[PDB]
Design a protein around this ligand. Structure first.
Ligand SMILES: CN(C)S(=O)(=O)c1cccc2cnccc12
Ligand SMILES: CN(C)S(=O)(=O)c1cccc2cnccc12
Lengths: 353, 19
């Protein structure tokens, strides 16, 4: 066989130990999901320092909690905007998931509250910036560098999928680098509790699995496809399927064809062909062996999955950090004033927030 | 090159989810 007796016994034991972990993690998540947090701070508890990012729903700002001096990232969502953008259920769901999950590579929600006009999700500040910016800046990550990040996504998806959460919006834009060089997954606006199948067309074109594009009822294997896209993009500097317009990207994705840079190792290419596998019955992460097909793949032979989870691996890259409020790793955004209307907007729609 | 095609695609910046 590929493993001798000591290796196989060690590997099987480790696999049962993570099953034991996930079982306990699932119980703690459900208990938190049934009894969630609410109204745990207020706006004047924070100084607003700088906008770190923007989106259709609102803005994310670096804030400083006045009492403690601690910095946080405060996501501000315009309620009326959220309605018009038909994002009520996503936003409520994201906040509900964020307060219920617990994993070292998932951003932690520290406070949440609302006022007449806005919803506020106060998350840990992740000062290293988006993986996106570093990837485009460096050009591409070495395979060990890409592997270090990929390993954390694998563990994170293993965790989320054990909670029956499909993530569905993996991309470097969504992955922040913390001070130790580890990954923080943010943005759960498309995550959903799915034990079986789900049908929503959602995600980012380059990262859509074929079965999403083809309007099938799909499952958590779309996350493993997206992992393949992420690994490819991290290691190549560009994603496997690109084109001027999303429709042409989709034609490439469903085509079953993928080309690799010549500098890709064969181990890497083998993993990618098994993740970027259009046939759901052959895609890694979707077979009887589950995530173990990925974690035991030759490309991950050097990965100490436990050490990664415990964050005992020295990161290949540590972002420039010049203090707790440093925003140098984030781009600059036009600053809009936070106006809290006198009239409560959309009170019914966000009652549970 | 494939990288040049990636540049020519114009989708080198931050990518939005579909809407
Ligand atoms: C992705 N960013 C640029 S962002 O939107 O500003 C952001 C979102 C969520 C949590 C964050 C934590 N720290 C820094 C930035 C954070
Ligand atoms: C083996 N342990 C339970 S653990 O090191 O705490 C751990 C926790 C969560 C996920 C894991 C995945 N792979 C290896 C170890 C993992």
């Amino acid at each position: 066989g590929h493993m001798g007796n000591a290796a196989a016994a060690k590997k099987g034991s480790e696999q049962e130990s993570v099953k034991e972990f996930l079982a306990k993690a699932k119980e703690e998540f459900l208990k938190k999901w049934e009894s969630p947090s609410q109204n745990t701070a207020q706006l004047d508890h924070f100084d607003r320092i700088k906008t770190l990012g923007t989106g259709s729903f609102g803005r994310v700002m670096l804030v400083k909690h006045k009492e403690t001096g601690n910095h946080y990232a405060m996501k501000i969502l315009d309620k009326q905007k959220v309605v018009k953008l038909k994002q009520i259920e996503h936003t409520l769901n994201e906040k509900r998931i964020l307060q219920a999950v617990n994993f070292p590579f998932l951003v932690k929600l520290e406070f949440s509250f609302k006022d007449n006009s806005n919803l506020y999700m106060v998350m840990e500040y992740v000062p290293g910036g988006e993986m996106f910016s570093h990837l485009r800046r460096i050009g591409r990550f070495s395979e060990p560098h890409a592997r270090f990040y990929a390993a954390q996504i694998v563990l994170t998806f293993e965790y989320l999928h054990s909670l029956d959460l499909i993530y569905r919006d993996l991309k470097p834009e969504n992955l922040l680098i913390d001070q130790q060089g580890y990954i923080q997954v943010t943005d759960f606006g498309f995550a959903k509790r799915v034990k079986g199948r789900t049908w929503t067309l959602c995600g980012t074109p380059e990262y859509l699995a074929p079965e999403i594009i083809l309007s099938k009822g799909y499952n958590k294997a779309v996350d493993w496809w997206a992992l393949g896209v992420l690994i490819y993009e991290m290691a190549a500097g560009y994603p496997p399927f690109f084109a001027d317009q999303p429709i042409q990207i989709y034609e490439k994705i469903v085509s079953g064809k993928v080309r690799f840079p010549s500098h890709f190792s064969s181990d890497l290419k083998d993993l990618l062909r098994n993740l970027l596998q259009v046939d759901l019955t052959k895609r890694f992460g979707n077979l009887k062996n589950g995530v173990n097909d990925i974690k035991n793949h030759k490309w991950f032979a050097t990965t100490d999955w436990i050490a990664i989870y415990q964050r005992k691996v020295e990161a290949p890259f540590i972002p420039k950090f010049k203090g707790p409020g440093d925003t140098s790793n984030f781009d600059d955004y036009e600053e809009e004033e936070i106006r809290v209307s006198i009239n409560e907007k959309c009170g019914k729609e966000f009652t549970e927030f | 090159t494939t990288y040049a095609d990636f540049i020519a695609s114009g989708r080198t910046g931050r990518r939005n989810a579909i809407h």
